[PDB]
Amino acid sequence: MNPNCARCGKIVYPTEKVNCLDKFWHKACF
Ligand SMILES: [Zn+2]
Structure with a gap:
């Protein structure tokens, strides 16, 4: 999960x- x-x-x-705002991305995905 x-x-x-x-x-x-x-x-x-x-x-x-x-x-970002409130959740998770990766470096180039910001
Ligand atoms: Zn990503």
């Missing part, structure tokens, strides 16, 4: 918890 990127679709590992 891992957080998938709100843009690409892949799991956002705890390494790459991008801070």
Whole structure:
């Protein structure tokens, strides 16, 4: 039940918890 990127679709590992509004993305997916 891992957080998938709100843009690409892949799991956002705890390494790459991008801070948008309220959820998780990756670096280039911000
Ligand atoms: Zn992504």
